[PDB]
Each structure stands twice: as C-alpha cells, then as structure tokens.
Design a protein around this ligand. Sequence first.
Ligand SMILES: OC[C@H]1O[C@@](CO)(OC[C@@]2(OC[C@@]3(O[C@H]4O[C@H](CO)[C@@H](O)[C@H](O)[C@H]4O)O[C@H](CO)[C@@H](O)[C@@H]3O)O[C@H](CO)[C@@H](O)[C@@H]2O)[C@@H](O)[C@@H]1O
Ligand SMILES: OC[C@H]1O[C@@](CO)(OC[C@@]2(OC[C@@]3(O[C@H]4O[C@H](CO)[C@@H](O)[C@H](O)[C@H]4O)O[C@H](CO)[C@@H](O)[C@@H]3O)O[C@H](CO)[C@@H](O)[C@@H]2O)[C@@H](O)[C@@H]1O
Ligand SMILES: OC[C@H]1O[C@@](CO)(OC[C@@]2(OC[C@@]3(O[C@H]4O[C@H](CO)[C@@H](O)[C@H](O)[C@H]4O)O[C@H](CO)[C@@H](O)[C@@H]3O)O[C@H](CO)[C@@H](O)[C@@H]2O)[C@@H](O)[C@@H]1O
Ligand SMILES: OC[C@H]1O[C@@](CO)(OC[C@@]2(OC[C@@]3(O[C@H]4O[C@H](CO)[C@@H](O)[C@H](O)[C@H]4O)O[C@H](CO)[C@@H](O)[C@@H]3O)O[C@H](CO)[C@@H](O)[C@@H]2O)[C@@H](O)[C@@H]1O
Ligand SMILES: OC[C@H]1O[C@@](CO)(OC[C@@]2(OC[C@@]3(O[C@H]4O[C@H](CO)[C@@H](O)[C@H](O)[C@H]4O)O[C@H](CO)[C@@H](O)[C@@H]3O)O[C@H](CO)[C@@H](O)[C@@H]2O)[C@@H](O)[C@@H]1O
Ligand SMILES: OC[C@H]1O[C@@](CO)(OC[C@@]2(OC[C@@]3(O)O[C@H](CO)[C@@H](O)[C@@H]3O)O[C@H](CO)[C@@H](O)[C@@H]2O)[C@@H](O)[C@@H]1O
Lengths: 403, 403, 403
Amino acid sequence: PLNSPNVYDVTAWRIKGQPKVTAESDIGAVINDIIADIKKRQSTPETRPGAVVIIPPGDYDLHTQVVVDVDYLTIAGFGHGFFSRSIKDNVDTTGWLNLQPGGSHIRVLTPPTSPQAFLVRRDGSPRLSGIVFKDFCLDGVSFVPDGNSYKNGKTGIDVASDNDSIHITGMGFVYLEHALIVRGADALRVHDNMVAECGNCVELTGAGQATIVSDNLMGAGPEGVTLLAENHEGLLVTGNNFFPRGRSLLEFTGCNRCSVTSNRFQGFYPGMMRLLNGCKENLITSNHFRRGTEGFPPFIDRTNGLDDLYGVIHAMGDNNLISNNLFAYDVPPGKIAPAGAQPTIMLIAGGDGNVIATNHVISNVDTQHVVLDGSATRSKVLDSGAASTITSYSPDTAIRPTP
Amino acid sequence: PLNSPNVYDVTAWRIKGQPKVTAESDIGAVINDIIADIKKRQSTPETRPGAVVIIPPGDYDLHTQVVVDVDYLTIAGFGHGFFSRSIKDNVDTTGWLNLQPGGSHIRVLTPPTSPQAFLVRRDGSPRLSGIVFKDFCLDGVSFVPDGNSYKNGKTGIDVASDNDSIHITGMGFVYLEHALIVRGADALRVHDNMVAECGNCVELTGAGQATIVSDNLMGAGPEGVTLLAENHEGLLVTGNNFFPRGRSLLEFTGCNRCSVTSNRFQGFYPGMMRLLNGCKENLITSNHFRRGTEGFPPFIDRTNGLDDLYGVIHAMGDNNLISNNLFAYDVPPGKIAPAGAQPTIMLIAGGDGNVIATNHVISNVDTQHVVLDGSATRSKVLDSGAASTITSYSPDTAIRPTP
Amino acid sequence: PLNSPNVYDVTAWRIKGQPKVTAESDIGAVINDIIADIKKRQSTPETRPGAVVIIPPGDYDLHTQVVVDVDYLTIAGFGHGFFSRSIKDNVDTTGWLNLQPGGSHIRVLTPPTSPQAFLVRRDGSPRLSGIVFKDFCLDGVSFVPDGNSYKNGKTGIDVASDNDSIHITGMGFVYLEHALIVRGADALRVHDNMVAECGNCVELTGAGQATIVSDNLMGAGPEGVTLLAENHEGLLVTGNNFFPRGRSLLEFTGCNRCSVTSNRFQGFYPGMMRLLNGCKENLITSNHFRRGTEGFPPFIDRTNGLDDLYGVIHAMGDNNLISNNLFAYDVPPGKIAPAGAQPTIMLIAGGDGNVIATNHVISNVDTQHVVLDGSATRSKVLDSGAASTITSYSPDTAIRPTP
Ligand SMILES: OC[C@H]1O[C@@](CO)(OC[C@@]2(OC[C@@]3(O[C@H]4O[C@H](CO)[C@@H](O)[C@H](O)[C@H]4O)O[C@H](CO)[C@@H](O)[C@@H]3O)O[C@H](CO)[C@@H](O)[C@@H]2O)[C@@H](O)[C@@H]1O
Ligand SMILES: OC[C@H]1O[C@@](CO)(OC[C@@]2(OC[C@@]3(O[C@H]4O[C@H](CO)[C@@H](O)[C@H](O)[C@H]4O)O[C@H](CO)[C@@H](O)[C@@H]3O)O[C@H](CO)[C@@H](O)[C@@H]2O)[C@@H](O)[C@@H]1O
Ligand SMILES: OC[C@H]1O[C@@](CO)(OC[C@@]2(OC[C@@]3(O[C@H]4O[C@H](CO)[C@@H](O)[C@H](O)[C@H]4O)O[C@H](CO)[C@@H](O)[C@@H]3O)O[C@H](CO)[C@@H](O)[C@@H]2O)[C@@H](O)[C@@H]1O
Ligand SMILES: OC[C@H]1O[C@@](CO)(OC[C@@]2(OC[C@@]3(O[C@H]4O[C@H](CO)[C@@H](O)[C@H](O)[C@H]4O)O[C@H](CO)[C@@H](O)[C@@H]3O)O[C@H](CO)[C@@H](O)[C@@H]2O)[C@@H](O)[C@@H]1O
Ligand SMILES: OC[C@H]1O[C@@](CO)(OC[C@@]2(OC[C@@]3(O[C@H]4O[C@H](CO)[C@@H](O)[C@H](O)[C@H]4O)O[C@H](CO)[C@@H](O)[C@@H]3O)O[C@H](CO)[C@@H](O)[C@@H]2O)[C@@H](O)[C@@H]1O
Ligand SMILES: OC[C@H]1O[C@@](CO)(OC[C@@]2(OC[C@@]3(O)O[C@H](CO)[C@@H](O)[C@@H]3O)O[C@H](CO)[C@@H](O)[C@@H]2O)[C@@H](O)[C@@H]1O
C-alpha cells in the first residue's frame, strides 16, 4: 500500500499454504501470519520498530486468538461501529435497517479455551511497549443462554504481561463478558473509547503506575465491573461518562494515591463507587453521582444484591478526600432495601483521617448523606448536609453541619 | 488504495457519467455518489458495516448538501486547517503568505434552501449509529454583508434524527453561522476540536443522554451560542477552553443532572453561563471564569443586550452545586451597564436548595459575589465572599462569609 | 498512495539528484525535499492548503534539521513507539528482545549548529496556522557524556514563530534535552502525548493564549521543566499525569487567569509546582500531589538543589485559588533539608489576596500545610489543616482551622 514492509492491510494479506483464508473468514489467523512476517524481518533487538495493521471498514469473523508479543504494534481501523444489541435483542426489529455493529467490525468467535480475541503477552524482557489499539469494533455477537445474561466467556483485549506506554483509543466494544483487561500497566492510557453492553468494561488487574483512564463512555452488566483497579498508584480517572448497569461504576482495591475527578456516574444499584481493602490518600472530587432505578423492562427486576445502606460511595481506607461532589438520589420508596430504611449516600466503612467536604445531596426520601462506621478514626465531615443527615457511630468524627 | 470497497478517496472517485464533478468542483456530489454505492453494495440489514471517506488535504468546494443516512460512516481528513478569517478581514494583509483555511479544506458554498454542508438524518429505525466526523475543516468562506456579521445561513454538520455513539474529533469549523447541531443525541462525543469564528459552535438540541463535550477550543459570535444543550441528562462538559465572543459560553435550557468541571471560560459580555428554564441537580465546579472587555477594535461597541446584574452565572432551577470556581471580573467603569451599577458575579434568579461554596472572586469595581432572588428558597452560600459581597433578597438563605 | 499530490509517504519519495538519500539514511533531507515540492505547487495565498507527510513504522535517522514554514502541514505516523532508554542504560539487558524505541521512530542525530529536528518558523506573515504533529516517535538516542545527564543539545519540535491552532497529539518523545518548545502559542492543543525521559518536556515560551495541555503522560529531568508556561493567559492544564524527575512538574512565570485542575503530580524533589514572578488569578484545584524520594538507584543522590521549606507548591503572585487538592508527602527524615526542618506543602512566597481552601495534607513528619511569607497580604487559609499546621509570618492572614 505504502513503500514500507511494516504497513499491513488485512484485506490484502495472503497466508502462504492457506490461500482460501481471508480477513472476512478468520482475521485472527491473518493477523497472526502478519505478526510472523514482522518477527521474520525484525530479527534482532536493534531492528524491531514494530508495524501497523490496517483494518478497513467491514464484517470480519475472528476464530483464532491473535497473540501480540512484539513491541510497537499498532492495530487500527477507521470506526468504532458501536450498536445497541441490548435494545435489538429485546424489541420488535421489523423494518430495522441494521441489526449488528459495523465500522472496522471484528465479530469475536473464539474457542472457549483461547477466548480472548487479542492476547498481549510476552514471556521475557523487557516489558512489551508502545502497543496501540485504535479505531475498530470488537463485537462478541451474542450472550448465552439469552441476550440479557451479560455472559459468553469472550474477551476483546487481554494484556497478560507487564506493559509500558500502551494506548487504547477510539475503540468500540459491544457484547463481550470482558472488553479490556490490562495486567501490570505502567503509563497506560485508555482514552476516548465506547465500552458498553459488556459484562465488564475496563479491568486494571495485578498492579499499575502512572495510568490515565480519560474521556470514555462505559456501561457494564449487573455481575461485573465498569472500571476496576487492583493495587494501582497515581491512577487518574478523569472526563469519563459511567452509565448503567454494572455491579459498580468504579471499583479500586488496594489503590493508593490515585484521583477520580470530573466524571459523571449514573447507577441503578447501590455501591456505584467502592474503594475497598484499604485504599489510602485518594482524591474523589468534582464528580456527578446519580442513583436511579432500571427503566429498561427486560432488566427492571435485576439487582447487584446490595442494600441502600451500602453507600453510593463505599470507602475502606486512610486519608481520602471526598469533596465537591453532587449526589442526586431518586429510588421509588418500594424499591429501597431494607423497607423503610434511609439510603446512605457516602459510607466510610473504616479507615483513619478521611475528609468529606463540600458535598450537595438531593433525595426523594430522608437519606443519611454520610454514615461513618464505628471503626472510623480522626474522620472530618464538612458542609455535606444538616446535622440530621450525618450519622457518626465513630465518637471522634469532627462534624461541621451545612449552615 | 486499500483492498476493500469500504475505503474511498474523494480525489480517486469519479461519478460515472460526470467526469467534470470532482472533489475540487463539488465534494458534496462526490460524497452523495459514494454513499449511493455504499447503499448499492450493503443491501441488507446484516451486510451494512459502513465505510470511510478519506479527504486528502486540499481546497474542495461543496455545492451539494451531503445526506448521511448510513450507520458507521467515517468521514476523515488529515488536518483541521483552522485560520483566523476574522483577523484576515480586519487588518492589513499585504505580504500575507496565506488568506484562507486549509488542511482537508471543504468550502461550504451550499444553496440557501439546503444550507447545511452535512445533513445526518434517517426517516426509519433504528437510530443512526457510530457515525465518525474526524480530522477535516468546514469553512463557510464568508460572513455577509461584511466579515463581522457572523451571518451566512450555513451549517457545518446537522444531525436531524435520533442518534447513538456519534464521534466528532480533530475537526476545524470556521465562518459558519452554525458549526455543529445534534438533535436527540445519546452517547455523543464532541472531543478535541477547533470550533471558532462561527455564529454558533455546538448546539445539542431537543434532548440527550450520556454525552461528553471534552478538550475543545470554542469561540462563537454575539447573537449565537458557544455550547447550548436542551433537555440533556448526564451531559459532562470538561477540559474545554471557551473564549469569546458568543452571547454565552455555556447555555443549558432544561438540563438536569449534568456536570461542568475543569473548563476555562473567557467572555466579554454578561451571562457567560446560563442555567435557564428549570435546570436541576447540575454540578458547576473546578472552572476558571474571566469576564473582560472586547479588545479587538472591529467589535469594541458590540454587546449581547445584557446588563452586568444578569450574572457571569445566571441560574434558574433547583439544587445546583456552584463550587470551587475562580471568577476574574475586569470591566472598565465606563463599560458597565447600567453605568454605576455593582456587577453581579453569580445570580440565583430563582429555584430551591442551590448551594454556592468555596468560590474566589476578583473584581476591579465593588461587585456582589452572589445575588439571590427573593423567589429563591433553601439556598446555602459558603465561603464565596465577605458579607458585603453577598445579597440575599430571599429571607431563608444561610450565609457563612469568608473569614 | 492517494490521488492527491498533498499526500506524501517518506519511504516512497526520491530526492532529485540525491538518489542515495532515503527516509532511513536522513528523513530530514527527504521531508525538506517534500516541503520544497509543496512550495512549488502551492504558490499563492489561496492555493496553500498544506499536505500530510506519512511516516510508516520503521527506524529513520534524521541528520538534517527540518524547517516547517507552511500552514496546514501534518507530519503523521502510526505509533508513539515509547521505550524506557533510562532503565535500559542502568540494568543488565542480557537476552532483552528489544533495545531501542520504535513505532514511526525518528532517531534525532542533529548537528549542534541546527540542533532541533523540526524547526517550525516563518519570518514572513501571517502566523503559522493549523500545523499538526501526531503519532510518531522523536528519540535523541543518548544523553552525553552518560545516559543519566538529561543533556544532549537536541530538541524534538521547536516552534519559534507566533502560531495559531497547532495540534500535537499521540506523540512519543524520549531522550531529548527539549521535547516540545512552542514560542507565542495561540489556540495550541498538546493532547494525549507520551513525553518522558527528556531533560525538558513541554516549554510554552514568550507568551500564549487559549491553550489546552490535556490527557498527557510526562516525566522530565532534574535540571529541566516538565510543563513550563511564560506569560500565558487562559492556559487550561487538565487531565495530565505528571511523574518525576523534572526540577518541577508545573512551572508558570508571569502567567495570569490560567487553570491547573484534574491532574496527577508525582515529585521526588521540593518545588513540584512553582507560580513564579507575579502569577495572578490562577485556579489550582482538584489536583493530586505526591512528594516521595528517588527509588531508582542511579538517581538516588540526584537533587534539584532545593530544600523542603521551598514548597510542594511555591506561589509568588496575587488572588490565586489553591483549593480542593490532596497532598501526600512521604520523605525519609534523613533525606529532609535542612536537618530537623518541617517540610512546607504550600508556600505563599509573596502576593496579595491568595486563598487556600479545603486541602487535605498527609505526611510522615510534622509539616506546615501552609507557610505565608512576611510579604504576603490579605491571604485567607480555610480548612487546610489545624492552627499548628498553618504558619503566617504575615500579620494579616485570615485562618479557619479544619474543625
Ligand atoms: O503518612 C501516611 C503514609 O505513611 C504510612 C507509613 O506506612 O502510613 C501508615 C498509616 O497506617 C498504619 C498501618 O495501619 C493502620 O492501617 C489501617 C489502614 O490500612 C488504619 O486504618 C489503621 O488505623 C491502622 O491499623 O498501615 C499499614 C498498611 O499499609 C500497616 O502496616 C500499618 O499498621 O499510619 C496511620 C495510622 O496510625 C494511618 O493514618 C496511615 O495510613 C503509609 O502507609 C502512608 O502512605
Ligand atoms: O478566533 C479568533 C477570534 O476570536 C477572538 C475572540 O477573543 O480573538 C482575538 C485573539 O487575539 C489576541 C488579541 O488581539 C488581537 O487584536 C489586534 C488588534 O490590533 C490584532 O492586530 C491582533 O493580531 C489580534 O490577535 O486579543 C486580545 C483582545 O483583542 C488581546 O489581548 C490580544 O492582543 O484572541 C484569541 C485568544 O487569545 C486569539 O486566538 C486571537 O488572536 C477574536 O478577536 C477573533 O476575531
Ligand atoms: O427530589 C428531586 C426530584 O424532585 C422532582 C420529583 O419528581 O422534583 C421535586 C422538586 O420539584 C418540583 C417542581 O418544581 C417547582 O415548583 C415548586 C413549587 O412548589 C418551586 O418551589 C420550585 O422551585 C420549582 O422547581 O419541578 C418540576 C418540573 O421541573 C415540577 O413538576 C415541580 O413544580 O420539588 C422539590 C421541592 O420544591 C425541589 O427541591 C425539587 O427540585 C424531580 O424533578 C427531581 O429529580
Ligand atoms: O539555602 C538555604 C538557606 O538560605 C536561606 C536564606 O537566607 O533561605 C532561603 C529559603 O528560605 C527563606 C524562608 O524565610 C524567609 O521569610 C521569613 C519571613 O517572611 C523570614 O523570617 C526569613 O528570614 C526569610 O528567609 O522563606 C520561607 C518564608 O517565606 C521560610 O520557610 C524560609 O525559612 O528560601 C526558600 C523559600 O523562599 C527556601 O527553600 C529556603 O530555605 C536560609 O534561611 C537557609 O539556611
Ligand atoms: O482586579 C485586579 C486586576 O487589577 C490589576 C491591575 O489593573 O491589579 C490590581 C492588583 O494589583 C496591584 C499591583 O501589585 C503589587 O501590588 C501590591 C503592592 O502594594 C502587592 O500586594 C502585590 O503583590 C503586587 O502585585 O499589581 C500590578 C501589576 O503587578 C501593579 O500595577 C500593582 O502595584 O491590586 C491588588 C493590590 O492592591 C491586587 O490584589 C491586584 O492584583 C490586575 O493585575 C488585576 O488583574
Ligand atoms: O520515577 C520517574 C522516572 O523514572 C523512570 C526511569 O528514569 O522510570 C521508573 C519507573 O518506576 C520506578 C521503579 O520504582 O519501578 C520499577 C519497579 O519494577 C523500578 O525499576 C523503579 O525503581 O517509573 C514508571 C512509573 O512512573 C515505571 O514505568 C518505571 O519502571 C522514568 O521513565 C521516569 O521519568
């Protein structure tokens, strides 16, 4: 196409010894053969600049898991091609002009034993570096045993090895149990993506450093995470629009010295935000929280098994700043668990030194804006409700009621 | 170019039977013919993955309105090509090496009866999905009768039918009366664009859900809007730089449970931000506001028809949190309207439970940091000025002055 | 490649008379001949729409400085190709599968007489407009005399003329004393870049207007800046992840009515943020600051020569809002200068009417959350620590202790 052997068009690649195989019939095999060509020509630690794999708009079945074990590989389409399969599966589509996602459209038809469409994994040194996924659709096609299970065992992109300077951007994920998993992320960017109608959206597993999750649209399933981070340091979550219906919208476990700022959070279940298992010194600020109830008939009765005393925020850690957030709670009294209970907006489950400052709460019912567990120590609650909206079972909580 | 019929180069496409109609002479007609061919080959609701329309950098005249009525259409250039036609039209251009915009440069020369370059509209189901406009320039060429009317009746992109997961990014819009309009937007993304020297910049009309307006440069004209949203829910506005000279910089009519955070606002008129017609449960935080006066001679006498008592923020609605903003007012006494009036910075025009917290105000003349209408109820004002600077005409407002 | 002469592939372009020069041998000489070609075809102020230069993935030497003196020039590649040269230069790389950066990889080998790989400068008129750098790697290859000096005389991109609407996105910069310099920047966007192991990262010099620095990963060298801005007005610095080891992470000199919000800052030295020489009406809000100590052995004894009384924030100017930040200071007591000193988190070195509000400080030792110089006037410190944590040498500081 261009005068480099490092620029690949998947619709122009012939696999030697498998001439009938196309990008349409199995783009996985085609890209595995492309990665082989790259490894045959890039034969030394000083001749490995990587390459780019172009995916034109079109419908491509992936049957073979692609293994990405080369630094500086870029896989690029020209469109995220997102489509609400969830609405399609549940409504009368008679006269509908389109019935599936498109753009640079990869349908994930992987074997159960290698379920992930893209497995980024290198045994050895150094960390895989500078890999870029952008501007194409990853479509799991269907959920089993019906379209509403948010279950099918398929993953879009799974980074298994310690990685450095990976960039995921302009992607479309639909109808995967797991859209994107990154283990061992240093200097990762997950930026300006459409990740919706997946069991789980973005999983930052193991540990991580200096990562940005920015400017994304995300919506997961009732038994799954929207954003999760395990043992992350200086993770920045900014500019994201988290909508339903994951078990949670944000979930840190053992995360310290991260920041969640200028996001929008709409949840249909309690525990939209969870800082778990001792999260220290985290900034949770300039965020809009909205706790509503399911309006899509097919999901009216599905729940995450948590009651309205769980918190919209549930926080177990030291020295977090939960400040300048708006909480708009609207749940029909007959859909609140337990019956007759006041919903808790912010629950400090435990930890030393946490500060709740400058928070506005609206509810359709009498709610406790802040409940502090008895185990909370040296906690401060400032201008986050009248005195009747603050419950401190901890006897050392300094409270300034909103005047 | 690539080995897929779903990739089109506007400079390579010949309209069979019309060898005169080129991308240079009428890029509209070329794109209409390309879309005709997309429809011809993609003739069932399960073979409609869409296409990409590549616009190489150049000067292309658009005479025929393009109608985008296909899902997953990407129209992609290689550069926004922004050029201040406004300075070109008002200073000595002797010796100037360039007098117009460029990049992937579409000159919008549409007839007054089909004035929008791009009409995205589908009478049918479902919602048009996953359309991408990226990395090219829309240039209205001239305002009439002179360069400073911000009037020509032309629109860049007009989404006139309910839509899902549209992506507009890396664009340049210039000298259009309307840059971008999106009716009934769901999961829309207006990201990292240059929308300046247009009568209106981004109008989000009718209703919407789950939209992000992020990381954009935006400057409109005095009878137009910079960003407007009608009846939007869960709209996040973040990381934008709004400069003059729109009638307003942000204008939400009837928007609820939206968020405006981490933006910079510079205007030359009163009412830079307007929450109008019952805006409820919205967060306005972590924003820098600058109210100054017109410095560019050709516009010094121009006004938006509003006095300094309207507010830098004008809010009509319930339970808005206006917090953690810096306000810098610098207007010569002789430019204040009415002459001898104390400028108002934040005006609660009416509504219930609005909270003003932790706002720093600097002004060159004595100003009221907050004014609250007599009709306002359950207002709280905290640490947003000294008592001299807060005026509550309502008797139920709680005020803690800044120490 | 495409059917427009305004689209160039650096691997496909032969230099007339120098048929021995390739993109590999000297990409600077090829790109200069490409710009020669652009200037031969585009020879009037209305036939100058620019061009895109495509850099395929590969290893390219650049011996010859590139002069970019045309509006709407896009230099584009397919990956940022970032690789930690710093870790490589200080560990056993036996059996390392890769030893340099890649993607669209420009090895910058400039002579000291023309040290900047890309000099963007026009001595003519008007201001250079709409130039786009995206999606390639600039790599200075080595520091001298040793890999740990962060010194080599080289610059990636130096914009030396007043400019308008330049866009720097998806870049990788590594091992350059200066990555990006933009003198006189108007409507500049430095968005979504990897700018690391560079003496200086982003230098915004002379003056500036309406600029956004967003969604960037940045790490500089201990005698150089990460983000510097001089006499910038209305600079928005948002969504960035700033890590060590810059002498500073953010440094303003004479910048007014700017905003630093929703950033992550990690420093190893005092003076991570400096608002120098009369900074006014700036917003420092919703940022996470971490002060730690060098953990990387080669740099353990390496310092920026400042002591712990200098400040995590060091502010000289008027009416700044430093609100809603979290500061996490953890420095082994043996590594605190002077010996036995209380580290300063926020130093108001001078200025009138600055306001510190709603700041949570964590430290391992007794800190002063806020020190205000005797030359400070009309300062205000709200809910940013107990009385014992706020030190005012100035007699007129209004202090509300955290309750
Ligand atoms: O200054 C903050 C930084 O300093 C440390 C140094 O280790 O802070 C430790 C810290 O807590 C001590 C410790 O345990 C406590 O842990 C609970 C939360 O994890 C806390 O709520 C309980 O009160 C207490 O049991 O944390 C570590 C585990 O990481 C454990 O080894 C310690 O026992 O000291 C203070 C309590 O006195 C806390 O405010 C602070 O978190 C470092 O962790 C901080 O980064
Ligand atoms: O998109 C540009 C249009 O939007 C505005 C809206 O403010 O921009 C002007 C602009 O300029 C800098 C500055 O001044 C200018 O005025 C001079 C008149 O003598 C002229 O010669 C300069 O070359 C021209 O740039 O604006 C302010 C007030 O005038 C002043 O401080 C400067 O000198 O401001 C924008 C953001 O700073 C820039 O992009 C733009 O250059 C509008 O004026 C334009 O029509
Ligand atoms: O709990 C928040 C939710 O409350 C709804 C309930 O569906 O809003 C209740 C709300 O407003 C009612 C209403 O408001 C107005 O008329 C009042 C006269 O009593 C006047 O005092 C208020 O200032 C004015 O807003 O808004 C809707 C339409 O916009 C209309 O049906 C009503 O007249 O009532 C509370 C007490 O007044 C307010 O705090 C609250 O906003 C729902 O919209 C919210 O999501
Ligand atoms: O190199 C360190 C040695 O240099 C000194 C200067 O003689 O300090 C430089 C330093 O700190 C000065 C400091 O104190 C100043 O203001 C006080 C009243 O406003 C006054 O009593 C002191 O005499 C005066 O030096 O500044 C802050 C207060 O502004 C305070 O924390 C400091 O002690 O300048 C930097 C900050 O501006 C610091 O990094 C540095 O220590 C000497 O004292 C040192 O031994
Ligand atoms: O509305 C504020 C705007 O007005 C300006 C000037 O048009 O600045 C006014 C301002 O600055 C005064 C001045 O300051 C020195 O002033 C004080 C000396 O007593 C000292 O406290 C300050 O540290 C120092 O800045 O600033 C300008 C230029 O720097 C100079 O002409 C003055 O001497 O007046 C107040 C002090 O009374 C300040 O709060 C305010 O900044 C403009 O710069 C503002 O944007
Ligand atoms: O600290 C910032 C600067 O250090 C660089 C090298 O100069 O990278 C270091 C790195 O991490 C620090 C460290 O603790 O991590 C590994 C543990 O596996 C050790 O080698 C180090 O002691 O910091 C980033 C995260 O910001 C990681 O990706 C690196 O490993 C440099 O790139 C940076 O500017």
